[PDB]
Design a binder for this molecule. Structure first.
Ligand SMILES: Nc1ncnc2c1ncn2[C@@H]1O[C@H](COP(=O)(O)OP(=O)(O)OP(=O)(O)O)[C@@H](O)[C@H]1O
Lengths: 590, 277, 147
């Protein structure tokens, strides 16, 4: 077809035998035939005998070389042995040919060692050629319409030529279904001439949808390896984004508008799976089996380019604060995962995150914009991680760092821990949470002396309390996070944290030998402001040891264990202690 | 055919080749920093040799002028011999720079390729697509204008299809429908099936129960799910197409629940029948 | 760790540092080599050599691996009593010292002791090449389990 098309644009008066172009399919389950008439250029007897009757040579290369040196066409086919693959499922083929300046001819063979040609008379053909087959008996399955439609959709549907079908279903009509290919490619012509709507249209015809996209990028690159992209972004987050199992086919790959292969454990990283597109190119080192690309380093070079020129769109779209809201609510999982596993581009990705801070009631706040308003003496950003929005909204630790007018953020989600664990810096600053081995903040001088006076005056109560509590806690001290609660629990730097303590238990497929080592040792914090701690002092210097101090201390400690999100191992022990006094509430136990 | 050009492509950042005892990220760092320091070292060498060539050429022009002005003059046999010796020496080191120039030019072809050499950008373009609003829906008028056409354009087709329940035809026809149909005529067709139940069409009645139960389930799941039902069919199709014996028996007991609902709707039907007629 | 660093260096790859903090002890006992921040000030005066701006060589890496593994077996730091960077470097200029011999473990294996003694005699340039060191490691390991 393309050969005769190009030849026509030299002398258009030579096409006086037929004035159109078309491709047609003829199934016939009566003599078991698969006629495949087209309307190509034709063929002469001499070229037929000295060209077709020889293994492994392409006449296309000779014809193309005969055509000057440098022209304007991009043709497909350079190996030559493509018709000899038609015998994989076949027993006898006959080709019916005629040229405008030649006579009608028929060629016959049956996979033997010889072939025949013969002149014939009958139905007159203008310029097309026929290929007729006799199908094998065991493979009488490809004849029905559904398999043919499936295979033509899967492999080749983008040829901009009218392939048509003439089956016969229930006075009975002659089905002339032409819609086999009716969605022409869009990355070919000038990018400026496209009028929006087909960008919305092509996406629907791409994957069986009735919604629209959210963005688009259409860059193209020249040089030695040349290709074009048609990337999109979907509006609605699929429920089955993580179902995998089924072979992943989000991103395809074409060479000269013919399907080759698809896979996205080399083309794009896993955390950017939700992107579709077309990555058509012109020439690559292909295989004799036209599905695999040898020299697989190319599939590694293309990845750098694709990720680099998608991240620019991702960064650009941070301008309109309206669309960014609907995008960020849907695909935040992908970015939060990607920040964990990547090294080349991490600092560039450290600003597309939006959080809720304690100055914005119901609006997300950027951390880059957060860098604007801090105090002068302050160092490093402060953050917290929790289980629920309200549960962390009013926490015991915060009640001290909130009175001084600073700013904090909440990362309350399992992946938030994964993100915050690895990233440790932002533009010269540090990321430190509230519960890491007793943080201290610069402040006025006169508070130092009274606090150290409490240090030097309350050493004995701190000394004698560790005896009654066996080896659970490491140390108890007075720090500055407590203004309305007596006690709290904080972890250590080298060790695990409370929320991931539950992400690990809740994880399904894990060993049970790891808990021995990297449990984080625990720290208790007291507040020498609540009158209870002072009331303890009189009985401390009064009574050396008795039952009441043991009861009160174990009670307060077990309550403090709940205060930091820790879950007890024997709830009956505390439930009995809470039920022990409600009976005194109404009086007589016995 | 010659693939000897596509045979030296390397990246600073390969993943398949790695070691069980080596940090992958730091290895990427080392490879890339080595590759860049090497390009910069070869750079420095190449402008060094280029400026050496430039000064050599300016000295060649200078010596050509010197030879010309000596040819104009005469009597300087000693000076002519000295400058001839100088020119011969300049030609000797000229072959020196020339042989090393050709050596490096030849080995340039042996240099492994990389991304920034193969590719030069030609175009790029983005877009946003934030078209104004989607819709605003009333409660009264729209219930008629689209409803009538939804009735005539699909009642006969659904009558034609509803006679069968074979799975792939049902799946694809329902995919077409959820791509095109809506809900009002769906419910209204269900109630036509209810008030046509008189003929006691057993296979038709089973398929009616199937279609009404799937549409009711889809609607409740979408409403509690706050998603458009027309885009909520795939998970249902994959759950019901592989519905095994236990899942089919759950379908049967929920169908029995629908069956006492059938008794209830039939009772209210008969009561309204006596009251109206 | 010897196998890992041998593999790394097998591709003509320099390290420019292998400070004992650059090791991550992963699951079980497995070494991951780090780069970002016992011999952190103990390299050869090759570093102090600032002539031709390219003193870097594999010899420094070999010597650093030797001293680092020897100290890691040993378990404590050399040269912790006298610390004068300026005077140390002036003394390096002339009157350079020698390693102390009293600081040695009792159960120093014969093969490793012989290797480390043989490493540095006159010049730090005739050091051996990696896989025979690896072979010495493997023979000494699979020559004294009990028998
Ligand atoms: N439909 C046809 N009409 C006329 N000549 C044809 C037709 N198909 C093939 N030929 C001729 O017979 C030769 C057989 O080669 P074929 O087209 O099968 O392989 P190719 O296109 O070179 O390779 P590949 O199939 O791998 O792309 C062609 O080069 C061409 O000269």
């Amino acid at each position: 077809l393309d050969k005769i098309r190009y030849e026509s644009l030299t002398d258009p008066s030579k096409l006086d035998s037929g004035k159109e172009l078309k491709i047609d399919i003829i199934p016939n389950p009566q003599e078991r035939t698969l006629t495949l008439v087209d309307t190509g250029i034709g063929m002469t007897k001499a070229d037929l005998i000295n060209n077709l009757g020889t293994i492994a040579k392409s006449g296309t290369k000779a014809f193309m070389e005969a055509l000057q040196a440098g022209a304007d066409i991009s043709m497909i086919g350079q190996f030559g042995v493509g018709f000899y693959s038609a015998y994989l499922v076949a027993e006898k083929v006959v080709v019916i040919t005629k040229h405008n300046d030649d006579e009608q001819y028929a060629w016959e063979s049956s996979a033997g060692g010889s072939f025949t040609v013969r002149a014939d008379h009958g139905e007159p053909i203008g310029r097309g050629t026929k290929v007729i087959l006799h199908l094998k008996e065991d493979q009488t399955e490809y004849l029905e319409e559904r398999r043919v439609k499936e295979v033509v959709k899967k492999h080749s549907q983008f040829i901009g030529y009218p392939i048509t079908l003439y089956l016969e279903k229930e006075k009975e009509k002659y089905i002339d279904q032409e819609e086999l290919n009716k969605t022409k490619p869009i990355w070919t012509r000038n990018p400026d001439d496209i009028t929006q709507e087909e960008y919305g249209e092509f996406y629907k015809s791409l994957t069986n949808d009735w919604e629209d996209h959210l963005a688009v990028k259409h860059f193209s690159v020249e040089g030695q390896l040349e290709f074009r992209a048609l990337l999109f972004i979907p509006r609605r987050a699929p429920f089955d984004l993580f179902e995998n199992k089924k072979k992943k086919n989000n991103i395809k790959l074409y060479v000269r508008r013919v399907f080759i292969m698809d896979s996205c454990d080399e083309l794009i990283p896993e955390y950017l799976n939700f992107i579709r597109g077309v990555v058509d190119s012109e020439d690559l080192p292909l295989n004799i089996s036209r599905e695999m690309l040898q020299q697989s380093k190319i599939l590694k070079v293309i990845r750098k380019n694709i990720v680099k020129k998608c991240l620019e769109l991702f960064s650009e779209l941070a301008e309109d604060k309206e669309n960014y809201k609907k995008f960020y609510e849907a695909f935040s999982k992908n970015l939060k995962l990607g920040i964990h596993e990547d090294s080349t581009n991490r600092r560039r990705l450290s600003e597309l995150l939006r959080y809720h801070t304690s100055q914005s009631g119901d609006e997300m706040t950027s951390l880059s914009e957060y860098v604007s308003r801090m105090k002068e003496t302050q160092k490093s950003i402060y953050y917290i991680t929790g289980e629920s929005k309200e549960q962390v909204a009013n926490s015991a630790f915060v009640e001290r760092v909130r009175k001084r007018g600073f700013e904090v953020v909440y990362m309350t989600e399992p992946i938030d821990e994964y993100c915050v664990q690895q990233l440790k810096e932002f533009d010269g600053k540090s990321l430190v949470s509230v519960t890491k081995e007793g943080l201290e903040l610069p402040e006025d001088e006169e508070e130092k002396k009274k606090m150290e006076e409490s240090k030097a005056k309350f050493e004995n109560l701190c000394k004698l309390m560790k005896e009654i509590l066996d080896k659970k806690v490491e140390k108890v001290t007075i720090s500055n996070r407590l203004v309305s609660s007596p006690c709290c629990i904080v972890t250590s730097t080298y060790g695990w944290t409370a929320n991931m303590e539950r992400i690990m238990k809740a994880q399904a497929l894990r060993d049970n030998s790891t808990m021995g080592y990297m449990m984080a040792k625990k720290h208790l914090e007291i507040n020498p402001d609540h009158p209870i701690v002072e009331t303890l002092r009189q009985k401390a210097e009064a009574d050396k040891n008795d039952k009441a101090v043991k009861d009160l201390v174990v009670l307060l400690f077990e309550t403090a264990l709940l205060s930091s999100g820790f879950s007890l191992e024997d709830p009956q022990t505390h439930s009995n202690r809470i039920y022990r006094m409600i009976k005194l509430g109404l009086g007589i136990d016995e | 055919v010659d693939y000897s050009v596509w045979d030296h492509i390397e990246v600073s950042d390969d993943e398949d080749e790695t070691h069980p005892n080596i940090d992958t990220a730091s290895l990427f760092r080392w490879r890339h920093q080595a590759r860049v320091e090497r390009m910069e070292q070869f750079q420095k060498e190449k402008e060094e040799l280029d400026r050496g060539c430039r000064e050599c050429k300016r000295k060649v022009a200078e010596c050509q002028r010197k030879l010309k002005e000596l040819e104009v003059a005469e009597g300087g046999k000693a000076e002519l011999e000295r400058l001839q010796a100088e020119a011969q020496q300049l030609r000797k080191e000229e072959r020196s720079w020339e042989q090393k120039l050709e050596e490096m030019r030849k080995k340039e072809k042996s240099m492994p390729w990389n991304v920034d050499t193969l590719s030069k950008d030609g175009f790029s373009k983005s877009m946003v697509n934030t078209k104004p609003e989607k819709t605003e829906e009333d409660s009264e008028e729209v219930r008629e204008q689209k409803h009538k056409t939804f009735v005539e354009k699909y009642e006969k087709q659904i009558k034609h299809f509803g006679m069968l329940r074979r799975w792939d035809d049902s799946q694809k026809y329902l995919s077409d429908n959820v791509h095109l149909v809506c809900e009002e005529t769906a419910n209204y067709l269900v109630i036509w099936c209810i008030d046509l139940e008189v003929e006691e069409k057993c296979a038709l009645m089973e398929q009616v129960a199937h279609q009404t139960i799937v549409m009711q389930f889809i609607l409740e799941l979408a409403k509690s799910l706050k998603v458009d039902p027309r885009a909520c069919f795939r998970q249902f199709f994959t759950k019901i197409k592989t519905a095994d014996r236990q899942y089919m028996e759950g379908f049967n007991d929920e169908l029995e629940a629908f069956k006492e609902r059938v008794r209830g709707r039939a009772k209210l039907r008969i009561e309204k029948a006596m009251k109206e007629y | 760790t010897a196998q890992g660093m041998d593999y790394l260096h097998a591709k003509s790859i320099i390290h420019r540092d292998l400070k004992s903090n650059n090791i991550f002890l992963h699951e079980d006992l497995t070494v991951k080599i780090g780069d970002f921040g016992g011999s952190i000030l103990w390299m050869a005066p090759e570093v102090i050599r600032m002539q031709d701006k390219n003193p870097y060589s594999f010899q420094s890496d070999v010597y650093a691996f030797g001293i680092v593994l020897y100290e890691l077996m040993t378990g404590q730091l050399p040269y912790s009593n006298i610390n004068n960077r300026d005077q140390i470097i002036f003394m390096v200029g002339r009157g350079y010292l020698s390693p102390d011999l009293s600081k040695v473990r009792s159960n120093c294996p014969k093969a490793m002791k012989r290797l480390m003694a043989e490493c540095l005699k006159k010049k730090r340039d005739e050091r051996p090449l990696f896989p025979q060191i690896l072979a010495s490691i493997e023979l000494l390991a699979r020559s004294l389990p009990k028998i």
